Each structure stands twice: as C-alpha cells, then as structure tokens.
C-alpha cells in the first residue's frame, strides 16, 4: 500500500527510487512456487516506475472503475457500530441524485 507515495518521492535528484529496485530484486528471490502472492495498490500510473511492470513481475494489471452505488446497504447492515440501521428510508434516493459519485466516502456520508 501507498505505492504512489514511493512513486511521488522520486523528486530530489534523497531519491530512494532504488528501494523499488531492491524490492524487485527480492521479488525474483521469490520462486514461482512457495505459493506466496504479491499485491500492489496504487492510484497513479504515470510515475509507476515501469521497470516494475516487466512481465512475470506484477504481470496482471486490474483497473478499478467508478464504484457501485450499493455501498450504503452493506456499510451499515454489515457494520452496526453501536447505531442501528437506517429504518424506513429510501436508499435509492441517494444514488438517484448520485451524491458523491466519484469514488468512495459514501461511508463518510454515513
């Protein structure tokens, strides 16, 4: 996580872009067996240090789209957090006006 912070710390040519190279050195220390699995999360593809995306090393890339509107149903039923569910309200009214319709923070609306 916070791989975009490592991506954004490349200014100052205290660079620490070679820490990514150390990570990729330890990545081929891992065999294709031993059943470990590496997951990289980022928010910005331009400064991704594209030596990372050499095939066989983080080979699959999944683009996460704009999120589904039905987060407000399971943000409170599956997480009570000392407060009950929103009883007798129209939950389709929130996605009808499409409030916060770019990413998360529907949980921040809750």
Q: Binding residues for other proteins, per CB under 8 A?
A: 2, 4-5, 8-9, 11-12, 14-16, 43-44, 46, 81-83, 104-105, 108, 110
Q: Which is nearer to other proteins, 90 or 108 (CB)?
A: 108
Query: What torsion do the CA atoms of 5, 56, 29, 11 make, to the nearest 10 degrees?
Result: -20
The least distance separating other proteins from the CB of residue 56, rounded to whole angstroms, comes to: 28
Q: How far apart are CA 9 and CA 47, in angstroms?
A: 10
Q: How far apart are CA 47 and CA 18, in angstroms?
A: 14
The least distance separating other proteins from the CB of residue 33, rounded to whole angstroms, comes to: 33
Residue 42 token pair: 């980022």
Tokens 């095939």 appear where?
55
The least distance separating other proteins from the CB of residue 81, rounded to whole angstroms, comes to: 5
Q: Which is nearer to other proteins, 16 or 61 (CB)?
A: 16
């Amino acid at each position: 996580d916070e791989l975009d912070s490592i991506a954004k710390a490349r200014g100052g040519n205290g660079a620490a872009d070679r820490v990514i190279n150390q990570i990729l050195t330890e990545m081929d220390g891992m065999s294709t067996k031993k059943n470990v699995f590496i997951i990289g999360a980022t928010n910005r593809p331009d400064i991704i240090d594209p030596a990372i995306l050499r095939p066989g090393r983080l080979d699959q890339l999944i683009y996460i789209p704009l999120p589904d509107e039905k987060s407000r149903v399971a943000i409170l039923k599956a997480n009570l957090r000392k407060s009950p569910v929103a009883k007798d309200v129209d939950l389709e009214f929130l996605a009808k006006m499409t409030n916060g319709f770019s990413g998360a923070d529907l949980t921040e609306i809750c």
